[PDB]
C-alpha cells in the first residue's frame, strides 16, 4: 500500500514549474488542483476555490505529483493556443 506514498518528491524546479503548469490551465481546470490539494491537505479546506491560496511548500509529495500528472494530462493534450 506504499505505492501511493512512494511517488518521488517534487523538486524545487519542479514545484515552480508545477505552480506554472497549473496556472496555465483554464480557470475550470484549476478547480481540479484546488480540489486535489484541499482534499489531500486537510489544512487548507478553509480556502474557498474562488479565492483559493495553495501553498506548494505545504503540499505532501503525493498531492504535488497528482497535481502535476493531472495538468500535464491537460497541457500535453489540447492547451497551448498561444505559443
Amino acid at each position: 500500500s506504499e505505492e501511493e506514498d512512494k511517488c518521488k518528491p517534487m523538486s524545487y524546479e519542479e514545484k515552480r514549474q508545477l505552480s506554472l503548469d497549473i496556472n496555465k490551465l483554464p480557470g475550470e481546470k484549476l478547480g481540479r488542483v484546488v480540489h486535489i490539494i484541499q482534499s489531500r491537505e486537510p489544512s487548507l479546506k478553509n480556502s474557498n476555490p474562488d479565492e483559493i491560496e495553495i501553498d506548494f511548500e505545504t503540499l505532501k509529495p503525493s498531492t504535488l505529483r497528482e497535481l502535476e500528472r493531472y495538468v500535464t494530462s491537460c497541457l500535453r493534450k489540447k492547451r497551448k493556443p498561444q505559443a
Binding site: I22, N23, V34, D50, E53, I54, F56, E57
Partner: peptide, 13 residues
Amino acid sequence: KWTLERLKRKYRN
C-alpha cells in the same frame, strides 16, 4: 512564491 498573487489572480482572472 505561489500565493494569492500568482495563483488567485491567474485563477479568478
